């Protein structure tokens, strides 16, 4: 359950991300592939080389979706409906992996937002990513 204060912290923090969203999304993916190798099993068709266009492009897609969620934090289920169906019916990623990507997104934000990553914002961002993950795996069965 995201509280009003949580939504304020997330919108403020994401705003600062601004135009680096895609670049940060790419970094988060690279951090995941290196730290948790088993997540690579879902991208055997990708060139997972550092700086690959495939990863940069995917990172931008991931960030745009998160941006969309922050914009509609009060109605994430409806806002991410399409992505929810896609992950549940087509991709079928085991739910465990969402926690790993969320963690890597947190580390990326921490490394790029020195002034904004306070303990309270850290807490709100973690809750936010968990909510997004929950919405994305809600139609699995």
């Amino acid at each position: 359950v995201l509280s009003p204060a949580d939504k304020t912290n997330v919108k403020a923090a994401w705003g600062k991300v601004g135009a680096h969203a895609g670049e940060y999304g790419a970094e988060a993916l690279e951090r995941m592939f290196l730290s948790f190798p088993t997540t690579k099993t879902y991208f055997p068709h990708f060139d997972l080389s550092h700086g690959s266009a495939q990863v940069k492009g995917h990172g931008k897609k991931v960030a745009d979706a998160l941006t969309n969620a922050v914009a509609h934090v009060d109605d994430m289920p409806n806002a991410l409906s399409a992505l929810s169906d896609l992950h549940a019916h087509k991709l079928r990623v085991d739910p465990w992996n969402f926690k790993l990507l969320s963690h890597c997104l947190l580390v990326t934000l921490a490394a790029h937002l020195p002034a904004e990553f306070t303990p309270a914002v850290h807490a709100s961002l973690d809750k936010f990513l968990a909510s997004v993950s929950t919405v994305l795996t809600s139609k699995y069965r």
Partner: protein
């Protein structure tokens, strides 16, 4: 893995009454029904749209038998699960691209199946010994991922 003389006897004794063909098919079938996303690895198996479809699928029964058979071999080498499943670990990673988390789910489903099949004979202590085994097999299979 490390099992006490008591846990070892419990595991082996129970396995002697297991019809691998029967149990394997039940375990894999329930995995695909209870955790549907695991179906992503068996697109070529046919119809898996319903529990009856999944449970009756001959390809599922066939594969289930193969999996439990290899699992059976590990029970014979509880002292070296890592070396025993090294080749299959590499295969599941490099060729099959199977998320090791799936090994954990199958282990849990297998325990439910043994409980369903054996009833009261599958006592808390016996389950405890089997949870150690499936966790060891799952970690042995994920050992070669990179």
């Amino acid at each position: 893995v490390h099992l006490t003389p008591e846990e070892k006897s419990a595991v082996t004794a129970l396995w002697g009454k297991v019809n691998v063909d029967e149990v394997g098919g039940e375990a894999l079938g329930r995995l695909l029904v209870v955790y549907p996303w695991t179906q992503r690895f068996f697109e070529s198996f046919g119809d898996l749209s319903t529990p009856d479809a999944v449970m009756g699928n001959p390809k599922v029964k066939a594969h289930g038998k193969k999996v439990l058979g290899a699992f059976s071999d590990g029970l014979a080498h509880l002292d070296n699960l890592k070396g025993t499943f090294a080749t299959l670990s590499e295969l599941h990673c490099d060729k099959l691209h199977v998320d090791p988390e799936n090994f954990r789910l199958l282990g849990n489903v297998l325990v439910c199946v043994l409980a369903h099949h054996f009833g009261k004979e599958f006592t808390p202590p016996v389950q405890a010994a089997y949870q150690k085994v499936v966790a060891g097999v799952a970690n042995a299979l994920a050992h070669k991922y990179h």
